[model samples]
Target: TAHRFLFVSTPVGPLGSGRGGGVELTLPNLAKALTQRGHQVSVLAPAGSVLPDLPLETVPGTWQSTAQSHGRATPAEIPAESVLARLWDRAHQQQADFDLILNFAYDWLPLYLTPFFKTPVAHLISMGSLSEVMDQAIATSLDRYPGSIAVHSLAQAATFPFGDRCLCIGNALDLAAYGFNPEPEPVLGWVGRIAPEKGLEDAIQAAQQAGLPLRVWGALTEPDYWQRLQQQFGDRAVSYQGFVSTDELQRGLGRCQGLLMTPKWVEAFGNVAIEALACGLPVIAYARGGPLEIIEQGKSGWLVEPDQQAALVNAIGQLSSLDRAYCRAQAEARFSLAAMGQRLEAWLLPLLSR
Candidate 1:
């Protein structure tokens, strides 16, 4: 039942570097889950990666992200050259040793190179449909290699034209690391990259409207956005606790009454939502994207109309009514790494047998 897995991580960011947002946790959790199941798992990431726990194969590459660049280009307009190609070349060089190649990058290069390699490649897409080029490449890859592309949420997969062809695997996390706190402080938690697309201003406005102190935790990816939020909400009860480690994150986040997820973009899968639920913290998220699937209305959390500040305020008022124990129970049942491993194995083993 055990087969070697070569996880090609995102070339745009390093593992444990906290720069890839949701992707930072994806590789580690999957690696841990598969390793626990006795699979020979190895991760390939950029040179600066710091995945101390997993077996890592580091490759040098110039980092570039589709989100940070190429926002307006068509499939033909975007350049094809990338240092990620170099990383893929390394994977190709070492392909024979592994049973399957698991690509975690959101770039087009990986999908484009799928047919050239003898080793079967399975892509775990970490973002929504952002680039036309990327979408075309993925669609082509799916045609050339059916059932190879996997998405975290239906909301994410829906963004692509070939939504029906892609696998919706959802996402998972190790529940043991996240401790629960039934009794929490009066603060509401906000976690994500401090960027315009994250909609942190909405959380601030909602927290101000509901009369709750908001504690924000995340990497300051966009200083301009962070600065503007602080300047606009200087009079409100909002505090920026700079990005902290996972242990510190849970320790601090566990003490919050609830977590607010207000992303302006369609998140592929809000890993933080599950992380909060793991800590017994209910999530009051915009009824958008991945959170729509993760939150069970009036149970695990509440989902409001996207970008509606008043809806967020009303949800905050009813946060106390939701049971923290239920949130933790739901997280363990659905998003645990053990369950995720089983699902992944089922989807993968049949393909490998061929």
Candidate 2:
């Protein structure tokens, strides 16, 4: 059989009975990008997920209860055993249908499903050590999990079986959509899910120190935090546009002079960092996980060590040296959809026929 790719992801998060924005954004971009390149693309979401009317297949969660769609996939009240059961059932079903499964997870399904299905699974490393699990028991969770694989950045690759093959790529910057000012502006923006791990508070601090207004975009984990941010920052924090569609996110970021990332953990990958670079905007971030992989020192953007307020303050001063053109060029060469398409095709083609 020709290698048909079935992109599998969990529910968007429970919104009464639907998924959340994170799941929504990650899967389609890759799936649609592949489809555009003349490859077969389908999505198998956690059961009962209703995505924006996008045409994709879905299956129910092994544990048959729905909860708020954020943080961890463990919706409170659903039995853990049930969730695992659903994952295993889906794994077998998914294995029969496609050549590979691409999932974005730190825990939950992969821990159970991979063993049952024996299908190749690639984990999209979103968030960071502190933000996701590792601040907890990340290693323990990943250690025994089979069917584990990962994607890599251009700067690095996995050493062991962690992720069998490394496809060096970054966030595909939709340049036409981001539309950033060719010349740098004075505005600083923070996009994506606004949570503690994201270092929104640090972003605010950086904004204040830099004397630039902060444009904070994306949805919040809880509405209370959203309101708290608005009340705390008042006019300094501009545009708390909760979870803009992917298009709007790129556009808003495109207009900004630079992007701010103050992650509290070792980030897995900074999609926003790469996206900002693609738009030709400099990124000022905490020198953590994925940012280090993406942002080159004094080049595309600047990184300060997490919790180092003094260094964070000083790093912002160096942003002027970062060139937007260089940033965009790097993004194009490394993170374009075309590049991903080629690498993915090469990897899946051999597997499909086997």
Candidate 3:
């Protein structure tokens, strides 16, 4: 059955003019997957992206690029405050026949748009504060949507209120897009912003201890950290290749032996890990946040004990024993886009039927 759904995404980037960040990427894939399943998907994101087929409604705001100097750029397209308000004001214009509205950003967009849509609103949260233990953003989200479902189950929840739904659908990978392995390379790599919390320092420390070379790739937006990282390891074999082109990222990541995702925060999920596993690359991620739940220690990837530098050292040393093919298979079985999309459909369809 074809169901009409409108997906509202957050700012494209810093200034609101670009393709997408992790949140932006998820919506397109979710929409595409649902469309493939015979659902009518219309995406309402900041206008200017090169997305095809889907009807995109343009809202006002400067389209600024947020690419970094060293780490991977999580491109953002941000709309202006006024434009956002107008969008929300016009949200009531969405067809009444629509099944439901899927919001991709937590605490930012979904909260503000809560009162606009009369249909059931499901919020997708992918932030890194579940471990804060003090931050009540989780509780606030649950309370915001009395009967709506929150897609990321990592949020704070002690119990459920009537009409409140929490679904822990794990991260997903576009197996068809990242599924194939590229020509092999020996170097280990990391892909993400060049923020301190992202665990760039940990990757360096682990590489040094294991006596292995590590190459870091991505768009680095933080000048201070970028300069600091260069000053610390600039002379070593650690190559700080500046913002890579789309083709470069795909080809480079596809061939690398491993990807390091040593995040210092308790994240909701890490799309990087799933992409790495799909590309047949072993990942050695810190057991801090969502990576622990996604990567089984010694199976899909090694999950170092939280704060255990020694454990990370040991994992890096034994990295040669990790199987790339096994990681890919595990990604296919558990984290593939098809699987997660189907799960999401099951949850949404019943709600629509009602």
Candidate 4:
């Protein structure tokens, strides 16, 4: 049976802003896959969001702060001009029409408002354990409605108290949009927000040691940190690509010999990892978090000890040994848009008749 899905988007930024990290990309891919499967979908996000080829209704207000920055057990902070609050307010008004509400926010308000709506609410958690309040909100919602939560990876789910309950849906993209490159230059590529947790410096330093030019791409979320990196490295080994479109990013990654992922924190999932793979670029990452599940050791990519720069630096030479085409094949075998759409439909199939 066809279902009506109301996708309430992230409060961190507009859908295409890249401020919401991976969820910014995950939203449209999921919606696209579902739409192709003959479901009705409508999106509600902050104003200025640009969702390609889907129904969208953008709300108004300032974007929400990142959930990754909050300390554990921190209090909820809904500013007077909170977009999260407003988005849910609108969701409340239109709840009667949709069969289900698919919330893409990592904040507290939407899950807290879950019971108030007649339509069932399903949450796609974008980050790992950050705050106790968020965990509590999800916990309560889970208690009230079983299988209401989904996560990108089981590694992400393990961070929450109710981790075991979440449906681990992995991730996907329009594989057809990705162009694979068999031959690449002796250059490295790094993509992520210019934040502390993403460990851009590790990539820069490792590239510097390896005597390879490293191209960086991502939103400059922390200007001070970026400037500090500039003073430390002085543009000898790294060049910033800025936040760019998926087409440009794939080209950037495809031209590189290997992609570096040196996240300091436990990333719920790294969409960029798969993106690199799709572009036929090998990945060199720390043995932690989502990349652990994504990269097969010494096969698709190499995994190093967590937070050790020398490990990343030492593994840099192994990039030439891996077959680039195999990397693209790995992504296709596991994470396809068709597989994702069917997986999501199956997960929601049991919940609809409730």
Question: What lDDT does the true structure give each of the candidates?
Answer: 0.83, 0.60, 0.63, 0.86
| Residues 49-86 of candidate 1: C-alpha lDDT, one tens digit per residue | 88867788787666765553557374433235555877
**RMSD of model 3, in Å?**
6.1
Give the C-alpha miss distance for residue 118 in model 2, angstroms. 8.3
Question: Among these predicted structures, which one has the highest lDDT?
Answer: 4
Which ten residues in a row are the worst by lDDT in model 2? 129-138
Instruction: Output the TM-score of candidate 4.
Output: 0.91
Residue 139, candidate 1: Cα error in Å is: 1.8
User: Predictions ranked by TM-score, top down?
Assistant: 1, 4, 3, 2
- Name model 4 segments beyond 4 Å from true: 194-198, 220-236
lDDT of 2 by residue, 121-233 (tens): 55554433222332223243346543233344533334223333334434553345555457755778787667656678777877777777788786666878767777876
Task: Kindly indicate the candidate among 1 and 3 with the higher lDDT.
Answer: 1
Candidate 3 is scored at a TM of: 0.79
Better of 2 and 3 by TM-score: 3
Q: How does each model score on TM-score?
A: 0.91, 0.72, 0.79, 0.91
Deviation of model 3 at 237, angstroms: 2.6
- Please identify model 2 stretches exceeding 4 Å from their true place: 11-22, 47-55, 62-97, 101-148, 152-176, 192-198, 220-234, 237-242
On a 0 to 100 scale, what is the lDDT of residue 9 in model 4? 89
